[PDB]
Ligand binder design. Structure first.
Ligand SMILES: O=c1c(O[C@@H]2O[C@H](CO)[C@H](O)[C@H](O)[C@H]2O)c(-c2ccc(O)c(O)c2)oc2cc(O)cc(O)c12
Lengths: 116, 115, 116, 115
C-alpha cells in the first residue's frame, strides 16, 4: 500500500482501534478535496486507502479523529483531531506510513517514507 | 495572556526561533478566520496573541510554519506545517500553553492548561 | 516473539538500522544481569531476543545505543543511550513491543503490551 | 542554574507536581554516585540542583520517578522510571534543561541547551 496509517494509545499501551481517518488532497482551486477514508483495525492500522496509480503528486491532509476515540473511553481530550499535512510523490512514487501516538492532552506524529 | 505558544527544535536542542505562527477561530460557516499571529522569539515563545476579553469559547487552530523553519536550516522536512486544533472551554483552567517539539519527519504537540 | 524492539529516525523518516540493543534483567542481588542483545534490521526491528520460557517475571532494562547511531551519521547527539526499564510478566506472560523514536536532542519511547 | 528539570503530564495537560528526581554522576569505577535530587514544584520544575562550580564535565543520569507519580493518580504505568543519560560538555551552551513529557505507557525527553 503506498499510504498506511498506524495509531497507538499511550495511556493503555495498545493499538488505537476503530479510529476514523479522513484523507484529503489539495485541488487545482486550493480547497481540500476528499481522497479516502477508513477506520483503524484491531492492530491500530489502516491499509487500502489508495493505489500507486490514484496516489499522484499533491498536498495531502490525513485527519485522525482522536476526540471521538478518547470520548468513547470516557476521556475529554484537548485536541479535536490530529492532522498531518504533507507533499507526497513530488520526486516520484514513495510509500508513506503516518504513525500517531495519542494521549488526552498530547499527540506525536511521525512519517516513515520508503522508496520501492 | 490566555494563549501562549512554545516551539523547540529536537535536532539542535534549542528553542525554535523566528517560526511563524498563525491562530484562526472557526466561524459559523465552518471556515477558519484569522485571529492572531506572530514569530517565535529567541526563547522559542510567542505571547501577546490575545486578551482574556477576546479569547472566548470556540474552536481554534494554531498553525506552526515548520516547513520554512527546516528549509532555513537546509534540512528536508516532511510536513507542510504543524496544526493544533482545540475547543477553548471556560469550565477549565484559564491559561493555554501549546508546546510543539519539532523534528524534520515528526512533531509532538502538548497542551499545558493552568489556573 | 514476547519482546520486540522497533527504532525509528525522526530526522530521516526511516527505520534506524544497525542500532545496538542490550537487554538486562535485575538479579536476586539487585544488579543488572545481561539477558539478551542484538542489532536492529533494515526495518528498524529486533526480533528473537528471547522465548516465552526464558522471559520470566522480573524487572528488565532495554538499552538502545542511540549515541553510536547518530555519530555514524555525523551527528553529535545529547543522550548516551535510550534506556527503557519495566516490570514484565507480573500478571502472566505478555508480548512487549518497545518502540523508540530518535532525534539528536530528544527521544520518545512507547510500549505496546498484548495478552496472547 | 546550569541544570534544570521540567516534567509535564500528557494525560491531565498539566505540570507533573511532586515527582521525585535523582541526578547521579558516573564515577571512575563506572558506578552512579548520588549528585543532587528533589521533587518537582507546582510548575513541574526542579531548579537549584547544582552550581556552575560543581557541574563539571562528565556523564550524568537524571532519574524521574514516573511510576510513583502514576500510582498516586490511580493509573497503571509501564515504566519503573524515566532515565536520561548524557555527557556535560564545556564546548556547548552553559544551561541544560531536561524536559520530560509523561504518559502511562510512553515518555519523551528533550534537552534544551542554551547560552
Ligand atoms: O522543553 C519543553 C518545555 O520547556 C521549555 O524549557 C526550555 C528552557 O530552556 C525552553 O527554552 C522553554 O522556555 C520552555 O518551553 C515545555 C513547557 C514547559 C512549561 C510550560 O508551561 C509549557 O507550556 C511547556 O514543554 C515541552 C513539551 C514537549 O513535548 C517537549 C519539550 O521539550 C518541552
Amino acid at each position: 500500500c503506498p499510504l498506511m496509517v498506524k495509531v497507538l494509545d499511550a495511556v493503555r499501551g495498545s493499538p488505537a482501534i476503530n479510529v476514523a481517518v479522513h484523507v484529503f488532497r489539495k485541488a487545482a482551486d486550493d480547497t481540500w478535496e476528499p481522497f479516502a477514508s477508513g477506520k483503524t483495525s484491531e492492530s491500530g492500522e489502516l491499509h487500502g486507502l489508495t493505489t500507486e496509480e490514484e496516489f499522484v503528486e499533491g498536498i495531502y491532509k490525513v485527519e485522525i479523529d482522536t476526540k471521538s476515540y478518547w470520548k468513547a473511553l470516557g476521556i475529554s481530550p484537548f485536541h479535536e483531531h490530529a492532522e498531518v499535512v504533507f507533499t507526497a510523490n513530488d520526486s516520484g512514487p514513495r510509500r508513506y506510513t503516518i504513525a500517531a501516538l495519542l494521549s488526552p492532552y498530547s499527540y506525536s506524529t511521525t512519517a516513515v517514507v520508503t522508496n520501492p
